[PDB]
Coordinates of C-alpha atoms in Angstrom, one line a residue:
Chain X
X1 CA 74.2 123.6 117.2
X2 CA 77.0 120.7 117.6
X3 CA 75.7 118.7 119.9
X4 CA 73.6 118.5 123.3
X5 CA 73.9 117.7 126.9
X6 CA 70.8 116.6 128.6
X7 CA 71.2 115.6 131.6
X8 CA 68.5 113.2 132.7
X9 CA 69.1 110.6 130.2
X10 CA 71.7 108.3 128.9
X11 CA 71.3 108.3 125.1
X12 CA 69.4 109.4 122.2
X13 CA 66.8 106.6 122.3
X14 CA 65.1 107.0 125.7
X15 CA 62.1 109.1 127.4
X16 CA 61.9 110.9 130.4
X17 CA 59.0 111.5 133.2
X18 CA 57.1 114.9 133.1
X19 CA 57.9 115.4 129.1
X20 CA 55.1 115.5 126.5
X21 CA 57.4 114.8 123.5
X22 CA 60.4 112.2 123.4
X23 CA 64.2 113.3 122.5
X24 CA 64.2 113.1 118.6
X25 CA 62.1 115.7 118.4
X26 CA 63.5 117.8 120.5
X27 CA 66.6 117.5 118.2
X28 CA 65.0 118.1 115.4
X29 CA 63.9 121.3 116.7
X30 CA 67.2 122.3 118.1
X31 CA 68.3 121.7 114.3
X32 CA 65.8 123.8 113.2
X33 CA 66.8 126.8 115.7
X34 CA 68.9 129.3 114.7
X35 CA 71.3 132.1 116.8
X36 CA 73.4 134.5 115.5
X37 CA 76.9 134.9 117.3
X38 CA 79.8 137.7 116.6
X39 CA 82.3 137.7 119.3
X40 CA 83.0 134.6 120.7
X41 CA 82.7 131.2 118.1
X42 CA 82.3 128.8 120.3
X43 CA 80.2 129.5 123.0
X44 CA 77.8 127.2 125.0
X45 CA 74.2 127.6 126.0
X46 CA 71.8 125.9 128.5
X47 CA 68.7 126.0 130.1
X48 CA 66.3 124.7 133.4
X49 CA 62.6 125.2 133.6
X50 CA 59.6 123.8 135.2
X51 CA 55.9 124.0 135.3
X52 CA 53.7 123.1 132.7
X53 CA 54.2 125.2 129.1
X54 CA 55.5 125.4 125.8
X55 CA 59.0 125.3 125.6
X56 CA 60.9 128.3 123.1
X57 CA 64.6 129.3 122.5
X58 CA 63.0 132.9 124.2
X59 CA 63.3 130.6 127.6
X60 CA 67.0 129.7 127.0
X61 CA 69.4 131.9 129.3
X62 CA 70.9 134.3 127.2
X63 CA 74.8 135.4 126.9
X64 CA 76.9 138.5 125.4
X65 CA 76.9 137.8 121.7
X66 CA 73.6 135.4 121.7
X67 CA 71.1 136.1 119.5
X68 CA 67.7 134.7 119.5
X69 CA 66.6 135.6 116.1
X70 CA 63.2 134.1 116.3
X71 CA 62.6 134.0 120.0
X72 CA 58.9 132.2 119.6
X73 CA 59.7 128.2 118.3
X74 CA 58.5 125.7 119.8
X75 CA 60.8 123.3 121.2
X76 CA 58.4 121.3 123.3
X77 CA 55.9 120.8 126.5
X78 CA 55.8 119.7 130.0
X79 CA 53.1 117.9 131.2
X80 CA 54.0 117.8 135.1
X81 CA 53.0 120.6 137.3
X82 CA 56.8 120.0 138.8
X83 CA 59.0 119.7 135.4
X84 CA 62.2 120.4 135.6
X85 CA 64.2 119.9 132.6
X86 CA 68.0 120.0 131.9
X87 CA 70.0 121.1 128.6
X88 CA 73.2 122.3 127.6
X89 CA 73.7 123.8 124.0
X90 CA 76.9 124.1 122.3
X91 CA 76.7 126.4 119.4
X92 CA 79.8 126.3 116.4
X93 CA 80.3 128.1 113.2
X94 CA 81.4 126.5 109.9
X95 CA 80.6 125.9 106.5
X96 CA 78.4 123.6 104.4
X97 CA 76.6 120.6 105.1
X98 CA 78.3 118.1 108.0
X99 CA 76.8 115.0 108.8
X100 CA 76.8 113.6 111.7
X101 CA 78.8 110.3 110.4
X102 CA 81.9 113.1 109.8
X103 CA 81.8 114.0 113.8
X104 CA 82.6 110.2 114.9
X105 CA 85.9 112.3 113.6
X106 CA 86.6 113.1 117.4
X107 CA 87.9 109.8 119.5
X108 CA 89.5 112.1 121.6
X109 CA 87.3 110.3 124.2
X110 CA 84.3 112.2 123.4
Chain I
X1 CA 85.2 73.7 131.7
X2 CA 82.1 75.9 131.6
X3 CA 82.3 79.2 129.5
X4 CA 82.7 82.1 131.4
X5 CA 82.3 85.4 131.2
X6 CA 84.4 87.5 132.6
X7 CA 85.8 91.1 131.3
X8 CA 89.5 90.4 131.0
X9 CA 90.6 88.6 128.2
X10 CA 94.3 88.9 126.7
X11 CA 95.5 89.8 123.3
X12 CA 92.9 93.0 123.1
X13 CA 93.9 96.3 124.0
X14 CA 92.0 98.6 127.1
X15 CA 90.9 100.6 124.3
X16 CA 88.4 97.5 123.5
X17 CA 88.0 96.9 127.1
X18 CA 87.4 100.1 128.2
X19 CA 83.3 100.5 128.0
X20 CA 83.0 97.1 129.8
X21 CA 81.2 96.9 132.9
X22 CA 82.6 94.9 136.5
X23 CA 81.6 91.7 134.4
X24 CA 82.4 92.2 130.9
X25 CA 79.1 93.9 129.3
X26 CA 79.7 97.3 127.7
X27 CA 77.4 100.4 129.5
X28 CA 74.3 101.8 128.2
X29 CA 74.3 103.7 125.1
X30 CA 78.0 103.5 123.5
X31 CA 78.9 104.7 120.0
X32 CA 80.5 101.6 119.1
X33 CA 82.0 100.2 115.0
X34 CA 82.3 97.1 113.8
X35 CA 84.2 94.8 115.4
X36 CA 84.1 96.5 118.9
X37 CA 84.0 94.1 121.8
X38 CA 80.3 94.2 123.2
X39 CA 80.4 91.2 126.0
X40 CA 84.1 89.0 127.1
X41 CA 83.7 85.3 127.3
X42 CA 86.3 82.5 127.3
X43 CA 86.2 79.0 126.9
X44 CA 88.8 76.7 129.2
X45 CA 91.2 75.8 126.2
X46 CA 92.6 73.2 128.1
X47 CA 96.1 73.2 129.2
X48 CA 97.4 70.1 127.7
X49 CA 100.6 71.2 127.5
X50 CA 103.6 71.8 129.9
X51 CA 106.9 74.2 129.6
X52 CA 109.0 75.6 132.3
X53 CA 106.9 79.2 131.6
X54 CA 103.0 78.2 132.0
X55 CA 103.2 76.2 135.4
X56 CA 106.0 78.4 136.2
X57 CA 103.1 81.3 135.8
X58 CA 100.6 79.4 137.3
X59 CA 102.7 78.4 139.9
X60 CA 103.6 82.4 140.4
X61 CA 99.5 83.5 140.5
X62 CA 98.2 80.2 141.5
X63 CA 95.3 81.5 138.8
X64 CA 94.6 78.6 135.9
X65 CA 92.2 81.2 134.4
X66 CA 95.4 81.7 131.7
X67 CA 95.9 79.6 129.0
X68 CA 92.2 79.9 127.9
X69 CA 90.7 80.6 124.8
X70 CA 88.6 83.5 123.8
X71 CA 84.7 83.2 122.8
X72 CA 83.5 87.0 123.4
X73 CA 81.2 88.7 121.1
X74 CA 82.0 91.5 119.2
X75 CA 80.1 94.1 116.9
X76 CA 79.4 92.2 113.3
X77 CA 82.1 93.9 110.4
X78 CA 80.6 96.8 109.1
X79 CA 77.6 97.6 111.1
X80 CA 77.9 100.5 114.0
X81 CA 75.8 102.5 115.8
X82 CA 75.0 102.3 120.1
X83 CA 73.5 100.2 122.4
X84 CA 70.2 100.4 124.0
X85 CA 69.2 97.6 125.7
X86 CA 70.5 94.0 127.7
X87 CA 68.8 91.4 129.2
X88 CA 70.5 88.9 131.0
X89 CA 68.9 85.3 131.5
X90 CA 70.5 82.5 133.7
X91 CA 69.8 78.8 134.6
X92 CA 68.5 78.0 138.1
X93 CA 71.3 77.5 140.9
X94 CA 73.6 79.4 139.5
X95 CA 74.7 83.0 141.0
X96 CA 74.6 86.6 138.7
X97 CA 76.5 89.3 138.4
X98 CA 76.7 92.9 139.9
X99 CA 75.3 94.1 136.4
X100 CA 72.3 91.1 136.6
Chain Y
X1 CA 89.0 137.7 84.1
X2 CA 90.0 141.4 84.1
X3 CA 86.9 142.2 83.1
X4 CA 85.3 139.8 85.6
X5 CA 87.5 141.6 87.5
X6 CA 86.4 145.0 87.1
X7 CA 82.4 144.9 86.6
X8 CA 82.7 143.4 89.8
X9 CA 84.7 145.0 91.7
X10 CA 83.7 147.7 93.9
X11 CA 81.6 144.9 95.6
X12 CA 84.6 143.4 96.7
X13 CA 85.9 144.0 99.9
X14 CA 89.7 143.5 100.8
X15 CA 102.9 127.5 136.5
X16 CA 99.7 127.2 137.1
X17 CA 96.8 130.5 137.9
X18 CA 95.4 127.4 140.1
X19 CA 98.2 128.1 142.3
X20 CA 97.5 131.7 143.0
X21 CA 94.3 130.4 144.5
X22 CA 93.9 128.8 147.6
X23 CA 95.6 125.4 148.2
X24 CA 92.2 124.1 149.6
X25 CA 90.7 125.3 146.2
X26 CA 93.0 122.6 144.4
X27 CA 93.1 119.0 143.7
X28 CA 94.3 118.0 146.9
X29 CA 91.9 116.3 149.5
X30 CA 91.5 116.9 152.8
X31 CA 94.3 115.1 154.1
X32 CA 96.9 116.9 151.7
X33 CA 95.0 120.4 152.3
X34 CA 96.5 120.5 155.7
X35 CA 100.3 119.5 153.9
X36 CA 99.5 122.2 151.7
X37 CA 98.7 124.1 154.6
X38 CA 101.8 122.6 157.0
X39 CA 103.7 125.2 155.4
X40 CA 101.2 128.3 156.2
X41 CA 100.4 128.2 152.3
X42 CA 96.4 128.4 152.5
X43 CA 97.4 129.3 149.1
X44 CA 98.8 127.0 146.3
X45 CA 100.9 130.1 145.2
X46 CA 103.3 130.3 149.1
X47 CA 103.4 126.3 148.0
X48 CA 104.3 126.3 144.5
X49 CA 107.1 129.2 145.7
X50 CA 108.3 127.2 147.7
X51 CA 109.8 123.6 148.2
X52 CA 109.0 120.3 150.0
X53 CA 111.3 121.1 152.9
X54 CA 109.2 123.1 154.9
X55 CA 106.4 121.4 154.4
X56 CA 106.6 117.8 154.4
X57 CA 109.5 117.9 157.3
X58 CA 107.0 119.5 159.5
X59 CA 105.3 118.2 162.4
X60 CA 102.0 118.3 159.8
X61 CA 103.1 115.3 157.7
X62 CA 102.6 112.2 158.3
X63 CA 104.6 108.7 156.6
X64 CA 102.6 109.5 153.2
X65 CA 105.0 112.4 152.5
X66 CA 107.1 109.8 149.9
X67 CA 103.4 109.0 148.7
X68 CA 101.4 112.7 148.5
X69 CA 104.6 113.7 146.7
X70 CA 104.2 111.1 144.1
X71 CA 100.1 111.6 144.2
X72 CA 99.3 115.8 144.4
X73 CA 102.7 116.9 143.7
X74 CA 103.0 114.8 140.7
X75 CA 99.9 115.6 139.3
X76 CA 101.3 119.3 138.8
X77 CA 99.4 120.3 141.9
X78 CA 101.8 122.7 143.8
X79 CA 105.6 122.2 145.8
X80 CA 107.4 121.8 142.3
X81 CA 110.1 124.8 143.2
X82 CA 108.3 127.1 141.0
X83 CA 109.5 130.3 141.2
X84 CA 106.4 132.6 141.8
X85 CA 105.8 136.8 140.6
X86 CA 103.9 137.0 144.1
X87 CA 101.8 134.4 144.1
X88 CA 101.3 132.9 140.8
X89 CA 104.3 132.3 138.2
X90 CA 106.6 135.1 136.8
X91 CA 105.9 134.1 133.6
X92 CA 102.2 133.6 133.8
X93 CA 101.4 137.4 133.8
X94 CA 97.6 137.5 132.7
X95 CA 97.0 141.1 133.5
Chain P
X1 CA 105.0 84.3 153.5
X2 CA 103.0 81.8 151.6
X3 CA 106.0 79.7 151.9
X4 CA 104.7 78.5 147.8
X5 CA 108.2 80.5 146.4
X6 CA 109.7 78.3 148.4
X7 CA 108.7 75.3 146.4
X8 CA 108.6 77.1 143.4
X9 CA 112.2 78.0 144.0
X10 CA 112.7 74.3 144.7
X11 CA 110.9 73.1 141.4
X12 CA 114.2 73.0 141.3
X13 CA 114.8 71.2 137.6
X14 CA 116.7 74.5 135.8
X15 CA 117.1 76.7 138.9
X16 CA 118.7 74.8 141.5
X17 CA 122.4 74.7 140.9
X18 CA 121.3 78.8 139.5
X19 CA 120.7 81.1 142.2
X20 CA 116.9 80.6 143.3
X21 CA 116.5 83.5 145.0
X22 CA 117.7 85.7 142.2
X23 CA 115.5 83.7 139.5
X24 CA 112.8 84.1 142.0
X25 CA 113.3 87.6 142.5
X26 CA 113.6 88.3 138.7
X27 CA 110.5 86.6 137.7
X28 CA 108.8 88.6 140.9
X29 CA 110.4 91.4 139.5
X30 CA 109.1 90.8 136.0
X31 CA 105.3 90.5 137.6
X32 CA 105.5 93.8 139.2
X33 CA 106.4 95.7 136.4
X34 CA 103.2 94.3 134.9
X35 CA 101.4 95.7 137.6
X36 CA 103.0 98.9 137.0
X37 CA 102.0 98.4 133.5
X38 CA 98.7 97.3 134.6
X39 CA 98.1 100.9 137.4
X40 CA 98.1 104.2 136.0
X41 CA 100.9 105.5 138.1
X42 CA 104.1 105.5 136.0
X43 CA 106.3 104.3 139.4
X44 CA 109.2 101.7 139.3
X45 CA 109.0 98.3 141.2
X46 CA 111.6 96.7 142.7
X47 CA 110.9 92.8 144.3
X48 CA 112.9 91.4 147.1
X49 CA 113.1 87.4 147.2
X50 CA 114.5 86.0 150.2
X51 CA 116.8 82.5 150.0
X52 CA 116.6 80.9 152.9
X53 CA 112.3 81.1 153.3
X54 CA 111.8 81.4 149.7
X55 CA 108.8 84.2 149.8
X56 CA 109.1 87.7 148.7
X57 CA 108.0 91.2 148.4
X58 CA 107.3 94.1 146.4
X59 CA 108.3 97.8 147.0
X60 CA 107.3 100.3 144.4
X61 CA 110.5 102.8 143.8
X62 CA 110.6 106.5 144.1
X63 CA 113.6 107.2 141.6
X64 CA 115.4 110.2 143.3
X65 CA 116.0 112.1 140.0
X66 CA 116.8 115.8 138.8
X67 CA 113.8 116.1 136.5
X68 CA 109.8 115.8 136.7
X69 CA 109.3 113.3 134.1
X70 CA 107.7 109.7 135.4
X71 CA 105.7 111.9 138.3
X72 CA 104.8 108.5 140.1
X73 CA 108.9 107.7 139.7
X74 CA 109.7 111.3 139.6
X75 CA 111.7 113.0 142.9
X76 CA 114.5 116.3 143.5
X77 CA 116.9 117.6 146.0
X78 CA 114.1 120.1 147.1
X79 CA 112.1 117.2 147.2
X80 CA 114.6 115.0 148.9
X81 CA 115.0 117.9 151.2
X82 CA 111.6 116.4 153.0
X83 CA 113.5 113.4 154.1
X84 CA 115.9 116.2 155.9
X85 CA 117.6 115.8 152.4
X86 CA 118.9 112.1 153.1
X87 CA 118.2 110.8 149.1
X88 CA 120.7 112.2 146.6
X89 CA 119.8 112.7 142.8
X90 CA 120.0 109.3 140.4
X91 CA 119.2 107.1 143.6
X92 CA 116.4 104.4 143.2
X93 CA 115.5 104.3 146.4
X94 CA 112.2 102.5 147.5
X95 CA 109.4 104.3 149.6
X96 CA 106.4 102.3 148.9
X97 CA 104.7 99.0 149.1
X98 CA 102.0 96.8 147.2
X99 CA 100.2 94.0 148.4
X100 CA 98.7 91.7 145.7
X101 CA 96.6 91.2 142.8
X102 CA 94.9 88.6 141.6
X103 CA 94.6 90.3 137.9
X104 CA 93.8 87.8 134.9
X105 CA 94.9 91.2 132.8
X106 CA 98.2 91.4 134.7
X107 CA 98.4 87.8 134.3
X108 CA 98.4 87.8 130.3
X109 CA 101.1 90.3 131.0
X110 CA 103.4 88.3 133.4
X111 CA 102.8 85.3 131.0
X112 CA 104.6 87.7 128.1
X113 CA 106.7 89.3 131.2
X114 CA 108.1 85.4 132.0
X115 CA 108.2 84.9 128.4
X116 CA 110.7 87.6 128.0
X117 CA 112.6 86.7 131.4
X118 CA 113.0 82.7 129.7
X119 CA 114.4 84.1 126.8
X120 CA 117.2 86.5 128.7
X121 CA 117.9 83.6 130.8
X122 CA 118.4 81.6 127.3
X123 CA 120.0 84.3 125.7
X124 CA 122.6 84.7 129.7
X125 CA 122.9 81.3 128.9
X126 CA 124.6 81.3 125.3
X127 CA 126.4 84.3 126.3
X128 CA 127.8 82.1 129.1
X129 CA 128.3 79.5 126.8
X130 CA 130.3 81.5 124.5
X131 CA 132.2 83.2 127.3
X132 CA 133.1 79.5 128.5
X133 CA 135.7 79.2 125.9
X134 CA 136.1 82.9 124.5
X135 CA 138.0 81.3 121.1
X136 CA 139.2 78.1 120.5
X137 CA 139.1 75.2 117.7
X138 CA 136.2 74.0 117.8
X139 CA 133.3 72.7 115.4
X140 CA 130.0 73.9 114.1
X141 CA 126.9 72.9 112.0
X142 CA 125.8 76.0 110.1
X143 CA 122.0 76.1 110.4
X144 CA 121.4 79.1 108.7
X145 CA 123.1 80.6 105.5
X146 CA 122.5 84.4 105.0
X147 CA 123.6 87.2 102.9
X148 CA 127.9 86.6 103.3
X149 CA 127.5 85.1 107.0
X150 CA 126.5 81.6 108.7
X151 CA 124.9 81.1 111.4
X152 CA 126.0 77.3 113.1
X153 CA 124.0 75.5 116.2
X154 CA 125.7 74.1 119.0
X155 CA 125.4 71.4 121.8
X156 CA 123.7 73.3 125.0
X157 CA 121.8 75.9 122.7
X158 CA 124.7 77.4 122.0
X159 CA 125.1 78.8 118.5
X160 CA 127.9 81.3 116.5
X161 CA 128.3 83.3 113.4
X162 CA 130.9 83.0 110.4
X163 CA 131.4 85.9 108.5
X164 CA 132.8 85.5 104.5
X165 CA 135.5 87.8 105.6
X166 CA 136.5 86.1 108.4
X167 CA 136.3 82.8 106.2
X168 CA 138.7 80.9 103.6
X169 CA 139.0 82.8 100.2
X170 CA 138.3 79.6 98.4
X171 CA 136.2 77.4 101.2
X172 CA 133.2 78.3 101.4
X173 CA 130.9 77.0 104.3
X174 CA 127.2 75.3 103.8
X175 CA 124.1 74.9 105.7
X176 CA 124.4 71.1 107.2
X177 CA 128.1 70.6 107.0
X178 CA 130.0 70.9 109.8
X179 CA 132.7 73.1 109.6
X180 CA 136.0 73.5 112.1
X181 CA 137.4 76.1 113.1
X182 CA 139.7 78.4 115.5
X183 CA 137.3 80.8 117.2
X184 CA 138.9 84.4 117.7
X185 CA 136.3 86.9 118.6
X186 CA 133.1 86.9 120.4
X187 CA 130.8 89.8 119.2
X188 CA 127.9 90.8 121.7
X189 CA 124.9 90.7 119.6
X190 CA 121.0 90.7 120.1
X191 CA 120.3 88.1 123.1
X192 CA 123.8 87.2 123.6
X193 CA 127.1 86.8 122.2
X194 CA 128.3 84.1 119.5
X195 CA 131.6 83.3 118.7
X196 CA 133.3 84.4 115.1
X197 CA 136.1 82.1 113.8
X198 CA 138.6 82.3 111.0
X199 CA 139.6 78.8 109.4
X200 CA 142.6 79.9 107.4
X201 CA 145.2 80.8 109.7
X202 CA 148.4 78.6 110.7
X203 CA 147.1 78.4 113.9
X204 CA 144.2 76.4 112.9
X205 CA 146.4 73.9 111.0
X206 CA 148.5 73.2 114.4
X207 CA 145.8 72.6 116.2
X208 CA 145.1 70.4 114.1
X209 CA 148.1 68.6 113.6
X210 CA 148.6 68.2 117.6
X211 CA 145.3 66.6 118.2
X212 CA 146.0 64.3 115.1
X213 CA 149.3 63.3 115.0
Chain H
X1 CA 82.0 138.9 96.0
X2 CA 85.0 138.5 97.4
X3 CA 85.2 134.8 97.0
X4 CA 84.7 135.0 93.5
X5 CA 87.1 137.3 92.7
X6 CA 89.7 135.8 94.8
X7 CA 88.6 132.5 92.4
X8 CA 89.2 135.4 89.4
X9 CA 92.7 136.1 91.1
X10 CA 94.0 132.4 90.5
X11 CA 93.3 133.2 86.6
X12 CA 95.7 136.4 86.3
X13 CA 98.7 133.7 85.7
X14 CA 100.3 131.3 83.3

C-alpha cells in the first residue's frame, strides 16, 4: 500500500464517530496487509461498510488482478449499529525498504 | 499602529501563501518544513519617508496597508511535520475573523 | 566467474475523446451547454469539428461570446477548428 | 469617476508640463497588468485615462492572434468569424472589463510595477537628454571607470560612456576629472541611450579655439 | 538467479 484515502477525516491524528479503534492502527494494519497483483501495477482499491463487525481485507471490493492472499486479518471494528465507513487503497510495486520521509519526494501538489 | 494579521504579505511567494485561510492561518492538517509560513502578521513600519513612488501608490489604491513591515510566524528551521490544532484568543471589544 | 557462471546456470532465466461525448458531458456550465448546443452540437465532437461561426453568431449567444471563448474554449473545451474522424479527432484513433 | 486621478494627475510636481493623462494611463496601465499577474487568466489589460476629467478605466484585451497560446489572450479568424469576422489576426482589440480591487498582494506588485514605470520614465528621460544634443563638445565627470570604458554623470541625470578606443592614444581619462569632449555617437543601451565622444579629432580643437579666442 | 549472474556478467571484462 502507498497511501490511503479516508474520507471522513482530515489527517492522520484524528477519531471518528461509530469506530472502535483510532486511525494509526488502522494503518498499521493496512501495512501489515498484503495483495498480490499481475496485470495492472498500479491499481487502486476501496471499500464501504456498515453495521457492527470486524473489519477484514475479505470485505474490501475486489478487482481483476486482486488478490487477497490471507482474506481473514483484522483491520478493525464498528461499534454503531449504523457505521458506515469510507477508504480508498492505492496499491504500488517496488523494491526495498521506503520510508515515508522519501515520499515528501512528490510536491507535485499532493 | 496595532499588529495585524492579515494573509497577504509581500516579498513571499503564493507557494508560501497558498495553505492560508481567508485571514492568514494555514488549514487543518498540512505537511509543512521548516520555515513554512504558518500565520501572516505585519506591524505598521511607519511611513516616514516620502518619494514620488509610495504616495504616488497610495495615492493610486488609497490603501496605506503598504509600506509595512512583516511579523508572521513561520515553521522553526529544521523541524517539519502537520498541523493539528488552533486556538484563537482575542481581547474584549474587538471583532474575529471568519476562521474565529 | 565462469564457473559461477556455469554451476549456476540452468537456474537462470533470460483532440480530445471528451469531445466525442456529449457537449453537456463537458466542462462547460449550463449557460455554455446551450452555446455548445447553439450550433446543434449536443455533442462536443459536431463542436470541436466545427468553428465559432456558427455558434457564437447565432441567435443562442449572448454578449459573453468574447468571454465563453476566452473561459470554455480556452480551457481546451471544444470550438478549436479541430478537424474530427466523425466525431472525435483523426488522429485520436483508440480502437 | 472618483475624480482622485484628477488630482493625482494634478500632483502635478514632475507630470505637469509631461502629458498627465499618458503618465496616468501608464501607471493605470502598470496596475492592471498586476492584476493580471495577480488572476489566473493569462489575458492582456489595456487602461484608458481620460485628460480632461482625469479618471480612468480598465479593459482586459482579447489579442486577435493566429495561435492558441495565452487562452485568456488567445483568439483566430475562425474565432473572429463570431464577431461576423470583423477582428483580423495580430489585432489587440479589447472585449472585456474589470472593476476594482482593493488587493494588498496586487498592491506589493503595483508598488514594484510603479517602481519599474519611475525608472523607464528616468531612463525616457536620459534618452531625451541625450537625444537633446545628439553630439556636441561638451563636458563630463567620469563616475565610474571600468574595464577600457568610462562611464561620466551629467546635470539633469543625464550620464554617457567613453570608450578607450574612442579615446586619446596617450590621454587617458579618470574617475573625478572632468574630461571635454566632441560627442559623436549616441549608442541605445540598457534604460536609455548615452552619448560616446572622441577627444582627439581636429574638430574638437576648433571648437575649442572659437569658444576661447 | 538471474540477478546474480547478470552481477557475474559485469566480471567477464577487463
Amino acid at each position: 500500500v502507498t497511501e490511503v484515502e479516508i474520507d471522513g477525516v482530515l489527517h492522520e491524528y484524528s477519531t471518528k464517530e461509530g469506530v472502535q479503534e483510532d486511525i494509526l492502527e488502522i494503518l498499521l494494519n493496512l501495512k501489515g496487509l498484503a495483495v498480490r497483483v499481475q496485470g495492472k501495477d498500479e491499481v487502486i482499491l476501496t471499500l464501504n461498510k456498515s453495521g457492527i463487525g470486524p473489519v477484514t481485507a475479505a470485505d474490501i471490493t475486489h478487482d481483476g488482478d486482486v488478490e487477497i492472499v490471507k482474506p481473514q486479518h483484522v483491520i478493525c471494528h464498528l461499534t454503531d449499529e449504523n457505521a458506515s465507513i469510507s477508504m480508498r487503497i492505492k496499491v504500488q510495486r517496488g523494491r526495498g525498504y521506503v520510508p515515508a520521509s522519501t515520499r515528501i519526494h512528490s510536491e507535485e501538489d499532493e | 499602529g496595532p499588529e495585524e494579521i492579515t494573509a497577504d504579505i509581500p516579498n513571499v511567494g503564493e507557494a508560501a501563501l497558498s495553505k492560508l485561510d481567508e485571514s492568514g492561518i494555514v488549514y487543518i492538517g498540512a505537511e509543512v518544513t521548516g520555515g513554512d509560513i504558518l500565520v501572516g502578521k505585519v506591524t505598521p513600519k511607519g511611513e516616514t519617508q516620502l518619494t514620488p513612488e509610495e504616495k504616488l501608490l497610495r495615492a493610486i489604491f488609497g490603501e496605506k496597508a503598504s509600506d509595512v513591515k512583516d511579523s508572521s510566524l513561520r515553521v522553526p528551521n529544521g523541524v517539519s511535520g502537520t498541523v493539528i490544532d488552533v486556538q484563537v484568543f482575542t481581547r474584549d471589544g474587538v471583532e474575529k475573523d471568519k476562521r474565529a | 566467474a565462469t564457473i559461477l557462471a556455469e554451476q549456476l546456470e540452468a537456474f537462470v532465466d533470460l483532440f480530445d475523446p471528451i469531445l466525442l461525448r456529449p457537449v453537456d458531458d463537458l466542462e462547460l456550465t449550463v449557460r455554455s451547454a446551450n452555446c455548445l448546443k447553439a450550433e446543434a452540437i449536443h455533442y462536443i465532437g459536431d463542436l470541436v469539428q466545427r468553428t465559432e461561426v456558427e455558434l457564437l453568431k447565432t441567435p443562442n449567444l449572448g454578449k459573453k461570446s468574447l468571454t465563453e471563448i476566452k473561459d470554455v474554449l480556452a480551457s481546451r473545451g471544444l470550438s478549436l477548428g479541430m478537424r474530427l474522424e466523425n466525431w472525435p479527432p483523426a488522429s485520436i484513433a483508440d480502437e | 469617476m472618483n475624480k482622485e486621478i484628477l488630482a493625482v494627475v494634478e500632483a502635478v510636481s514632475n507630470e505637469k508640463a509631461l502629458p498627465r493623462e499618458k503618465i496616468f494611463e501608464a501607471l493605470e496601465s502598470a496596475l492592471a497588468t498586476a492584476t493580471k499577474k495577480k488572476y489566473e487568466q493569462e489575458i492582456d489589460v489595456r487602461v484608458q485615462i481620460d485628460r480632461k476629467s482625469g479618471d480612468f478605466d480598465t479593459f482586459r484585451r482579447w489579442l486577435v492572434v493566429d495561435e492558441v497560446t495565452q487562452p485568456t489572450k488567445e483568439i483566430t479568424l475562425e474565432a473572429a468569424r463570431y464577431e461576423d469576422e470583423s477582428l483580423n489576426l495580430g489585432d489587440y482589440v479589447e472585449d472585456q472589463i474589470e472593476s476594482v480591487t482593493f488587493d494588498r498582494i496586487t498592491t506589493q506588485t503595483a508598488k514594484q510595477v510603479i517602481v519599474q514605470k519611475v525608472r523607464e520614465a528616468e531612463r525616457a528621460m536620459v534618452v531625451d537628454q541625450f537625444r537633446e544634443h545628439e553630439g556636441e563638445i561638451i563636458t563630463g565627470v567620469v563616475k565610474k571607470v571600468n574595464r577600457d570604458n568610462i562611464s561620466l554623470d551629467l546635470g539633469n541625470n543625464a550620464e554617457a560612456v567613453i570608450l578607450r578606443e574612442d579615446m586619446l592614444p596617450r590621454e587617458n581619462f579618470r574617475p573625478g576629472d572632468r574630461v571635454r569632449g566632441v560627442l559623436y555617437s549616441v549608442r541605445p543601451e540598457a534604460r536609455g541611450a548615452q552619448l560616446f565622444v572622441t577627444r582627439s579629432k581636429p574638430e574638437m580643437l576648433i571648437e575649442l579655439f572659437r569658444i576661447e579666442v
